[PDB]
Amino acid sequence: AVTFYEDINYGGASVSLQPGNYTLSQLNTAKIPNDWMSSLKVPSGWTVDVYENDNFTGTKWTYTSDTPWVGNDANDKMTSVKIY
Amino acid sequence: KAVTFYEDINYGGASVSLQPGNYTLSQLNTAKIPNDWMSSLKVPSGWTVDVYENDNFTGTKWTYTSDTPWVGNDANDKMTSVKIYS
Ligand SMILES: [Ca+2]
Ligand SMILES: [Ca+2]
Ligand SMILES: [Ca+2]
Ligand SMILES: [Ca+2]
Numbered sequence: 001a002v003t004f005y006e007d008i009n010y011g012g013a014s015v016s017l018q019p020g021n022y023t024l025s026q027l028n029t030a031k032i033p034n035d036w037m038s039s040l041k042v043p044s045g046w047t048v049d050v051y052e053n054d055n056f057t058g059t060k061w062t063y064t065s066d067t068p069w070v071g072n073d074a075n076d077k078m079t080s081v082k083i084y
Numbered sequence: 085k086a087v088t089f090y091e092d093i094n095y096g097g098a099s100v101s102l103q104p105g106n107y108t109l110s111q112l113n114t115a116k117i118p119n120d121w122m123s124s125l126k127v128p129s130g131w132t133v134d135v136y137e138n139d140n141f142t143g144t145k146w147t148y149t150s151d152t153p154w155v156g157n158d159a160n161d162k163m164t165s166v167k168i169y170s
Contacts, residue, residue: 051105051106052105053111056106057105057107057111058105058106058107058111059102059103059104060103060104060105060106060168060169061104062104073103
């Protein structure tokens with residue numbers, strides 16, 4: 001599973017998700033708010049595509065390993081996400 | 085690294101740089117890229133650009149993997165939505 005974090009360097013509230021394609025509604029149901037994610041852990045061999053807008057549209061930021069900082073553009077922008 | 089779209093062939097005219105992602109017509113226009121406008125593009129190494137004729141990634145699809153001074157006659161001024169990925 002992938003773990004998403006509120007704050008940089010794996011800080012604040014955290015929620016883990018198995019692979020899948022999660023819309024904003026599905027994220028909210030798992031207690032992940034909109035425009036909230038700052039860091040994440042990604043198991044080796046997995047890809048996380050973070051989308052700026054809902055339904056897997058808008059800018060996409062790709063992570064293939066643990067990161068304490070998603071970057072200036074990606075920070076607090078996650079609205080949908082694909083994990084595969 | 086970003087994809088730069090140009091108004092005219094040979095990287096001419098107005099230009100807009102875009103990060104990877106799946107952009108609908110609405111999102112393209114918000115990024116200041118008009119409909120049916122793109123004529124050439126620069127593509128970062130190892131990136132793929134899927135240019136769609138219609139909205140929501142439908143219609144004819146043209147694919148580019150390097151700097152392209154001439155998108156081709158069919159593709160020219162037809163970009164309405166686009167997927168950029170590595
Ligand atoms: Ca945050
Ligand atoms: Ca967002
Ligand atoms: Ca043009
Ligand atoms: Ca078109």
